[PDB]
Structure 1
Amino acid sequence: SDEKAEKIKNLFNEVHTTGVLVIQQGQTQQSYGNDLARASTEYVPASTFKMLNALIGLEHHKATTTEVFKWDGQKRLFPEWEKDMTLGDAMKASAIPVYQDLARRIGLELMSKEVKRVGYGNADIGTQVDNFWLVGPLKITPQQEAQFAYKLANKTLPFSPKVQDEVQSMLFIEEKNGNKIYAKSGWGWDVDPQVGWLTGWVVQPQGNIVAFSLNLEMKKGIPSSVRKEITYKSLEQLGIL
């Protein structure tokens, strides 16, 4: 309804930024929030790109889910990143240096081919293999991110089913009221304006998949927890959680 839609718009209003939430069920998408035009606007994917990075890496055997990416000992952006980790550990922590390592393993030629083959966003990774998802040129819309998540959830992306299985496992967050929640956050803090993401899906008890992509502008005074916060209360308001 619009009872629901206005409640969701007001969620973005309270935190004094602009945002959109795209929801996909079956082949139908709906947009909510206080700036619906964001839904079809391109932004850098930031760490949401780890989903596809992992798919490509696993498909072509450039990494395994069990191997350990060693920490070289150099200081990193966050203390949580300063340890050895698996791709799954690094997915949960959004450990950028680990997935930059993976990107280099894949290499520019394979990465470009695969990004194009999948048709991800504007499918342009430029010439720098280990940051194209953080500062450009690669961009994607929230509509495309929601669709991507929906296909991943249904394992209809063009990768081996077991590879999609393994990446799903890395994205599992929690089980809430019988619903399984899968998600990947993103925060493009190296661009202006900063973009904040939460892309994922809900598996409801009977198996139905509800994909979503939250996209808003991150601002001073707006904590990163806002992404999951707004996403969850919006999903509760829509009766999905």
Structure 2
Amino acid sequence: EKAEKIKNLFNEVHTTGVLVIQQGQTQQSYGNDLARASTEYVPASTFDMLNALIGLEHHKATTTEVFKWDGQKRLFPEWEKDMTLGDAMKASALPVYQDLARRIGLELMSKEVKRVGYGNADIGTQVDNFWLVGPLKITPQQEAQFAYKLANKTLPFSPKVQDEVQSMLFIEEKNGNKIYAKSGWGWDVDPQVGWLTGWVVQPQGNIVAFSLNLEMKKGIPSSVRKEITYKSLEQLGIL
């Protein structure tokens, strides 16, 4: 019954999507197009999570430094403010993560993306846009696995840096559950891709990772990603 209900949540907003859930070493898929789970998409802003891990691990940034807004118009007004890396994570402020990517540099970025085995691990030659328009791609299954490992601090990085990136991703504590999440919207690719990748830590300690992936269309508000995710997690008894 739960799976049917989640399928219809996607039908109700008139697009196709999948929600991958990971608990322990096994995954389940829900939604109205389950085949999306094993299909590659650009990560868009969801790459910020790995960008931050690499930057912190290799001492290219700190968690307390402030990226000051220089007063120049940004793509979105939400980005026109002083930000730490964590603030920029929450706002998905691309210019901050492009700055970070340039600090890391192509050689180190390529080595680390390959070491961690992220998606197709192909970053090409352009260090500041490879996660937006290709060539880097990743499946929702892979995003859920990545989130699960970050949640358990089992990515191949220091525990300190994984703890720091977790803190950047914290959304809220709701009914005792701690919710961590990163959204993404690849709007200038066709078709458009929407992401919400994260995890829940339940009061008893259990970790449940998720990755929502759907086709974004004109007339579908971006708030659908969080709404469908939370409702689905509630249906599953995860929230």
> Do the structures match in fold with TM over 0.5?
yes
Compute the displacement of 1:18 (Å).
0.5
Q: Secondary structure at the match of 1:133?
A: coil
Distance in 2, Cα, partners of 1:125 & 1:56: 14
For residues 174-219 of structure 1, give each alpha carbon's deviation from its aligned partner in whole angstroms, at most 9, with x where no partner exists. Answer: 0011000000001001211000000000000011100000000000
Unaligned runs of 5+ in 1: none
Which 4+ runs in 1 deviate beyond 4 A? none
The alignment's C-alpha RMSD in Å is 0.5
Compute the displacement of 1:12 (Å).
0.5
Compute the displacement of 1:73 (Å).
2.1
Distance in 2, Cα, partners of 1:112 & 1:73: 32
1:30 aligns with 2:24: no
For residues 142-186 of structure 1, give each alpha carbon's deviation from its aligned partner in whole angstroms, at most 9, with x where no partner exists. Answer: 000000000000000000000000000000000011000000001
Q: Secondary structure at the match of 1:167?
A: helix
Distance in 2, Cα, partners of 1:211 & 1:7: 20
Aligned match of 1:208 = 206
- Structure 1-normalised TM-score? 0.98
1:58 aligns with 2:51: no
Compute the displacement of 1:72 (Å).
2.3
Aligned match of 2:19 = 21
Unaligned runs of 5+ in 2: none
Distance in 2, Cα, partners of 1:43 & 1:67: 32
Distance in 1, Cα, partners of 2:237 & 2:81: 40
Instruction: Pick from 151, 170, 186 the counterpart of residue 149 of structure 2.
Output: 151
Q: Secondary structure at the match of 2:131?
A: helix
Compute the displacement of 1:103 (Å).
0.4
Distance in 2, Cα, partners of 1:123 & 1:207: 32
For residues 103-143 of structure 1, give each alpha carbon's deviation from its aligned partner in whole angstroms, at most 9, with x where no partner exists. Answer: 00000110000000000000000111111100000000000
Q: Secondary structure at the match of 1:75?
A: coil
Distance in 1, Cα, partners of 2:233 & 2:136: 28
Compute the displacement of 1:67 (Å).
0.2
Identity of aligned residues (%): 99
| Residues 21-30 or 65-74, more deviating | 65-74
